[PDB]
């Protein structure tokens, strides 16, 4: 991996813990859904999904400060003009190309894991093959839904093809379902609220983020919907990308 020097052009502090960085670095083109590594000499490096469309040079990263973590608190300290090292070649297969044909593509993410979906929907290529697109972002509190405004513009842009839903687990917030993704699927509430069923006949489900959410959802979908982990060598219905 060859590292290049990037400059933070903008810092978006959504909450005390959530922030997005916009970086100009001479990186190579990537496929929406992919990730690169960011690093600081403390060289400590971590993977971060691109949030920007691959066609937009303002690289965007959505992060959360992990208090006891080594790199996140340092990136949280960066100010515009500061340098950060970035791997120029992207990696990752959490991309449309690896997604089978299906009538409804479900994109579920917890916390900062919504980034890859946003890159994909912002670029907006190769989506004609899906009749319905569903984007679900789950967080603890409503204040944590940093990209709700973007999701709303995207929904308008897609003229009904894309349905968006936010889920919050610790409060009641107008506009969101209260709960955890696995529970809402099981109770039929997610599908009822979104207006589309999630089954092996019509759907592919993309899961990204907290590994517990991913594992729980995958186990529930396997047991109750007979859905399976998708592999190149064994096509299925679920694609996952854990952030830890
Ligand atoms: C493919 C991939 C893409 C990722 N993309 C992003 C991204 O865009 N944004 C981002 O915020 N993180 C992302 N991560 C997570 C990331 O690389 C880091 O682990 C991170 O920011 C925390 O690093 P640290 O050095 O602060 O923590 P570490 O000292 O390395 O400690 C990590 C611990 O912090 C917790 N943790 C790790 N990541 C998170 C997270 N996203 N949310 C809540 N808790 C976390 C976990 O419990 C993990 O056990 C990604 C990881 C992978 C594998």
Swiss-Prot record:
One of its GO terms (biological process) is cellular response to oxidative stress. Changing residue 180 to A: Increases Km for NADPH. 15-fold decrease in catalytic efficiency. GO terms for molecular function: FAD binding; ferredoxin-NADP+ reductase activity. It is found in: Cytoplasm. Its cofactor is FAD. Transports electrons between flavodoxin or ferredoxin and NADPH. Reduces flavodoxin 1, flavodoxin 2 and ferredoxin, ferredoxin being the kinetically and thermodynamically preferred partner. Required for the activation of several enzymes such as pyruvate formate-lyase, anaerobic ribonucleotide reductase and cobalamin-dependent methionine synthase. NCBIfam families: PRK10926.1. Belongs to the ferredoxin--NADP reductase type 1 family. This is Flavodoxin/ferredoxin--NADP reductase. The gene is fpr.
